[PDB]
Symmetry: C3
């Protein structure tokens, strides 16, 4: 933007008319060129710093990007548009339910910027009944819907049933019949229920498939409800 | 910024020169002090509200942080730089492939702010062949590379082979030989393939290690490709 | 904002006083109405584009939201407050420790916007001792505390011990005693240690419960420490 410098008036009153014309059209041009919304063109770095004036800038020198840089008392020339920061919460330690004994870090945390909740846990003992509640999350922690996740269990036990068929030849010698039964013996392994955690829409964490006395743990994170 | 107040001219034309000097240097000083980029120093709260003027402010009173606050028709004094919000998408329900029957919430969702995709599922029945496709994700959902994750399976079956060595003493009585064979019997448990989900670069979810008829499920999330 | 248009002075010097009054009060009103912080009311779209002037706007036409839009050399009319973008890092491939052989994509990545680290891996061979280190993360990757997660293992082996009770009737015929022992035989399945990964506060990934020679893998992500 052009800077207006006032000019010395003429020496006698007779020549005051053209002088007023020129000076007034100059000031009018400056006022219009400023009032249209033209702060000027970004130029070389500014002069003495003082809080109250903040000249915008082009790429690079004052700031990496173009825009309207603005300094302050600290005089750090804040970027165009200031925001201190954003940060999630802290890991809230929760007392286990159903008399479960913590085997490590069993905590939960928000992430509002993520719209999620992250939970780590490792417990032993307590009620191992399927569907037993280990943690009741507050309403703000409620998932949008029912959810299931795999869970770690120190014990993954199986059941084995052994079947001994009757001897093929009942008239065979007892040693031969026993050997035939033994050679034709079979073993069937039962279904093993993998440890899993089920979280409902009301923020209740339930265990299923976890054997009694098994060190059960896991770390995970799940999205929250939509955040209007 | 200083406010310029016009002054009354003198009473007679003879003394018009010094008056013009003073008033013009005053207006020139004001115009330069404004055109250098000095809106002024942030001060006590402003006066009557009207859309069109938006005075910036210091920390605290008008807004928690310094900067250029700007109100509007609603007159809420928006922070320096306005942005409505950002929000991820909704959980898209997908029809299971390979004739799999959903046992619960089987959905997937974007998170563009996260550059990730979050998928929950729980299914039974259908084709349990290793490498069978259960969901073909669209191209925007494609992971950067091949990926493998553990999967929950309601059935974790094992195989057991029983071995009966021949009697140590063939000349022993048949009861003794049978007892020796029985006491020297051995059992070997086979390898159990843990249920796992494999997602490729083309967004195809494949099952492996999941037994036939086993309720297989899991909830997880994975980062997307880099988003230029 | 009103635009000031300079006016023609009167024809003779005698009538110069009221003219100065009117023109000076006009320019003073304009200067005050501009210096109070009133750029004007957002109006219909602006006129010839040139770098240096950037008129703000109302909702819709120039930009979807209200505010102070500002164009540039490219003349794209950047939104009120400019920011190029934010983006996470790349997946850093890491050489497995303990002579582990990679079976696929074994990489790790930062997410500073997420304050998290995402790791995928699939390895075979090497040292399968519990607590063996497979990757030592740098300090910036250190989790806030100790953490445990389930791990996928291609082998989930069990141990089975078979018990043969002595015959109920020692005076029974040897065939009957053998049949009674066989029918009263029992099988006990041992505890199976599920594969799991433990990550400590110093960024060391340890394996536990993974059988020797088992293809062990998994993909996961964990939050980092709080980022001040």
């Amino acid at each position: 933007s052009q800077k207006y410098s006032p000019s010395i008036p003429p020496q006698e009153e007779e020549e005051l008319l053209p002088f007023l014309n020129e000076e007034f059209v100059r000031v009018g041009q400056t006022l219009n060129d400023l009032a249209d919304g033209y702060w000027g063109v970004s130029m070389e770095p500014p002069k003495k710093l003082k809080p109250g004036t903040v000249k915008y800038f082009a790429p690079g020198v004052v700031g990496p990007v173009s825009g309207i840089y603005h300094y302050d008392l600290d005089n750090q020339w804040r970027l165009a548009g200031t925001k201190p920061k954003d940060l999630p919460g802290d890991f809230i330690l929760f007392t286990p339910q159903n008399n479960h004994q913590p085997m490590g870090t069993c905590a939960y945390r928000m992430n509002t910027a993520k719209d999620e909740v992250w939970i780590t846990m490792l417990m032993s003992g307590g009620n191992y009944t399927n569907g037993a509640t280990v943690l009741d999350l507050p309403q703000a922690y409620w998932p949008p819907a029912e959810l299931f996740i795999p869970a770690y269990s120190s014990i993954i036990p199986a059941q084995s049933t052994i079947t001994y068929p009757p001897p093929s030849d009942p008239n065979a010698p007892p040693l031969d019949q026993v050997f035939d039964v033994l050679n034709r013996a079979t073993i069937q392994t039962g279904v093993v229920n993998q440890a899993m955690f089920k979280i409902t829409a009301n923020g209740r964490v339930l265990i299923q498939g976890i054997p009694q006395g098994a060190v059960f743990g896991g770390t995970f994170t799940f999205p929250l409800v939509v955040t209007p």
